[PDB]
Enzyme design. Sequence first.
Site, mmCIF file in Angstrom:
data_model
loop_
_atom_site.group_PDB
_atom_site.id
_atom_site.type_symbol
_atom_site.label_atom_id
_atom_site.label_comp_id
_atom_site.label_asym_id
_atom_site.label_seq_id
_atom_site.Cartn_x
_atom_site.Cartn_y
_atom_site.Cartn_z
ATOM 1 N N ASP B 25 0.826 -1.202 0.000
ATOM 2 C CA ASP B 25 0.000 0.000 0.000
ATOM 3 C C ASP B 25 0.863 1.257 0.000
ATOM 4 O O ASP B 25 1.475 1.600 1.013
ATOM 5 C CB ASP B 25 -0.934 0.008 1.211
ATOM 6 C CG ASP B 25 -2.059 1.019 1.075
ATOM 7 O OD1 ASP B 25 -2.066 1.784 0.087
ATOM 8 O OD2 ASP B 25 -2.948 1.040 1.951
ATOM 9 N N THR B 26 0.825 1.994 -1.105
ATOM 10 C CA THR B 26 1.632 3.201 -1.251
ATOM 11 C C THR B 26 1.058 4.354 -0.431
ATOM 12 O O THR B 26 1.770 5.295 -0.084
ATOM 13 C CB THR B 26 1.725 3.640 -2.726
ATOM 14 O OG1 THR B 26 0.411 3.698 -3.296
ATOM 15 C CG2 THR B 26 2.581 2.664 -3.524
ATOM 16 N N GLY B 27 -0.220 4.252 -0.084
ATOM 17 C CA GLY B 27 -0.901 5.315 0.646
ATOM 18 C C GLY B 27 -0.662 5.248 2.142
ATOM 19 O O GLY B 27 -0.978 6.188 2.872
HETATM 20 C C1 LIG Z 1 -1.625 6.973 10.797
HETATM 21 C C2 LIG Z 1 -1.219 7.417 9.599
HETATM 22 C C3 LIG Z 1 -2.270 7.739 8.539
HETATM 23 N N1 LIG Z 1 -3.019 6.517 8.211
HETATM 24 C C4 LIG Z 1 -2.558 5.607 7.342
HETATM 25 O O1 LIG Z 1 -1.506 5.730 6.718
HETATM 26 C C5 LIG Z 1 -3.503 4.426 7.084
HETATM 27 N N2 LIG Z 1 -3.686 4.233 5.633
HETATM 28 C C6 LIG Z 1 -4.909 4.007 5.122
HETATM 29 O O2 LIG Z 1 -5.912 3.845 5.814
HETATM 30 C C7 LIG Z 1 -5.000 3.991 3.592
HETATM 31 O O3 LIG Z 1 -3.695 3.814 3.041
HETATM 32 C C8 LIG Z 1 -5.905 2.849 3.130
HETATM 33 C C9 LIG Z 1 -5.296 1.502 3.519
HETATM 34 C C10 LIG Z 1 -5.646 0.480 2.440
HETATM 35 N N3 LIG Z 1 -6.969 -0.115 2.689
HETATM 36 C C11 LIG Z 1 -6.788 -1.571 2.783
HETATM 37 C C12 LIG Z 1 -7.938 -2.188 3.258
HETATM 38 C C13 LIG Z 1 -8.633 -3.082 2.451
HETATM 39 C C14 LIG Z 1 -9.774 -3.711 2.936
HETATM 40 C C15 LIG Z 1 -10.227 -3.436 4.222
HETATM 41 C C16 LIG Z 1 -11.672 -5.364 4.306
HETATM 42 C C17 LIG Z 1 -11.360 -4.071 4.717
HETATM 43 C C18 LIG Z 1 -12.129 -3.450 5.696
HETATM 44 N N4 LIG Z 1 -13.239 -4.109 6.235
HETATM 45 C C19 LIG Z 1 -13.568 -5.397 5.790
HETATM 46 C C20 LIG Z 1 -12.778 -6.020 4.833
HETATM 47 C C21 LIG Z 1 -9.517 -2.560 5.035
HETATM 48 C C22 LIG Z 1 -8.371 -1.937 4.555
HETATM 49 N N5 LIG Z 1 -7.678 0.127 1.783
HETATM 50 C C23 LIG Z 1 -8.753 0.904 2.003
HETATM 51 O O4 LIG Z 1 -9.087 1.317 3.115
HETATM 52 C C24 LIG Z 1 -9.713 0.988 0.807
HETATM 53 N N6 LIG Z 1 -10.689 -0.107 0.900
HETATM 54 C C25 LIG Z 1 -10.630 -1.162 0.076
HETATM 55 O O5 LIG Z 1 -9.822 -1.177 -0.854
HETATM 56 O O6 LIG Z 1 -11.447 -2.231 0.290
HETATM 57 C C26 LIG Z 1 -11.266 -3.210 -0.737
HETATM 58 C C27 LIG Z 1 -10.454 2.331 0.766
HETATM 59 C C28 LIG Z 1 -9.447 3.483 0.781
HETATM 60 C C29 LIG Z 1 -11.280 2.403 -0.519
HETATM 61 C C30 LIG Z 1 -11.390 2.454 1.972
HETATM 62 C C31 LIG Z 1 -5.602 5.305 3.085
HETATM 63 C C32 LIG Z 1 -5.225 6.350 3.913
HETATM 64 C C33 LIG Z 1 -4.038 7.030 3.672
HETATM 65 C C34 LIG Z 1 -3.649 8.069 4.511
HETATM 66 C C35 LIG Z 1 -4.477 8.464 5.555
HETATM 67 C C36 LIG Z 1 -4.082 9.484 6.414
HETATM 68 C C37 LIG Z 1 -3.957 10.793 5.637
HETATM 69 C C38 LIG Z 1 -4.557 11.888 6.120
HETATM 70 C C39 LIG Z 1 -5.670 7.790 5.787
HETATM 71 C C40 LIG Z 1 -6.068 6.766 4.936
HETATM 72 C C41 LIG Z 1 -2.951 3.154 7.747
HETATM 73 C C42 LIG Z 1 -3.303 1.922 6.909
HETATM 74 C C43 LIG Z 1 -1.432 3.250 7.894
#
Ligand SMILES: C=CCNC(=O)[C@@H](NC(=O)[C@@](O)(CCCN(Cc1ccc(-c2ccncc2)cc1)NC(=O)[C@@H](NC(=O)OC)C(C)(C)C)Cc1ccc(CC=C)cc1)C(C)C
Lengths: 99, 99
Positions: B25-27
């Site tokens: 995850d690049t984000g």
């Molecule tokens: C504390 C520092 C800031 N926070 C972060 O860096 C966090 N990163 C993330 O949550 C992020 O990179 C998303 C993670 C990837 N996630 C991975 C992921 C995938 C599935 C879920 C499955 C997931 C949840 N619930 C049931 C089944 C949960 C997480 N995917 C999704 O959440 C996506 N969802 C999906 O792709 O679903 C397919 C989506 C963005 C569309 C909600 C997106 C993101 C990136 C940066 C920030 C902070 C910026 C202000 C918030 C969110 C965590 C993971 C480190």
Amino acid sequence: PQITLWQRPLVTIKIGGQLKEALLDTGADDTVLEEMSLPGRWKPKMIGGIGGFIKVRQYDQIPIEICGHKAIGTVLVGPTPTNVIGRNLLTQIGCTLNF
Amino acid sequence: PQITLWQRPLVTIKIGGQLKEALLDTGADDTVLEEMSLPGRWKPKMIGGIGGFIKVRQYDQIPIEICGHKAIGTVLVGPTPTNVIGRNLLTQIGCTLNF
Ligand SMILES: C=CCNC(=O)[C@@H](NC(=O)[C@@](O)(CCCN(Cc1ccc(-c2ccncc2)cc1)NC(=O)[C@@H](NC(=O)OC)C(C)(C)C)Cc1ccc(CC=C)cc1)C(C)C
Ligand SMILES: [Cl-]
Ligand SMILES: [Cl-]
Ligand SMILES: [Cl-]
């Protein structure tokens, strides 16, 4: 271009004629944007993040420029901590991961 | 390798003796894994994504192996709904975005 990840991969996008910052996120199936206006009808979606589930509005076939690269695709709008550009548009603009 | 974004970019990692699947995850600022045991010191942390925050334990200087690439870095353990590799470790194995 080539984007290293020593910082947040933040880019400028254009949607509806306005410039916005957004985060290129390969861990995201979908592209979700903070509250904004878009044309046409919308459908419901529940999407799950690390923190749980939110409800968003789904718009289809919406033009959007990512880094000056033109795409047209599905945009969700909802309570997200940032604008994120998920795989659905990343593939339109020819993105891959390399190491 | 070059990794495509037609599908979720899942990879195997070795960490703490165990094999695990996880999502490039690049984000993501940080790397977060489902509940598991790690040696040594930790402190509590709240991290934020879509749908809000969760509480994790933070361990630093943990050896991990990703696609055969050895790095060392910080690993958060907690009730995340899926395993994610964040920018903190993606950098160490020379991973970039390309288009
Ligand atoms: C504390 C520092 C800031 N926070 C972060 O860096 C966090 N990163 C993330 O949550 C992020 O990179 C998303 C993670 C990837 N996630 C991975 C992921 C995938 C599935 C879920 C499955 C997931 C949840 N619930 C049931 C089944 C949960 C997480 N995917 C999704 O959440 C996506 N969802 C999906 O792709 O679903 C397919 C989506 C963005 C569309 C909600 C997106 C993101 C990136 C940066 C920030 C902070 C910026 C202000 C918030 C969110 C965590 C993971 C480190
Ligand atoms: Cl799309
Ligand atoms: Cl680290
Ligand atoms: Cl580098």
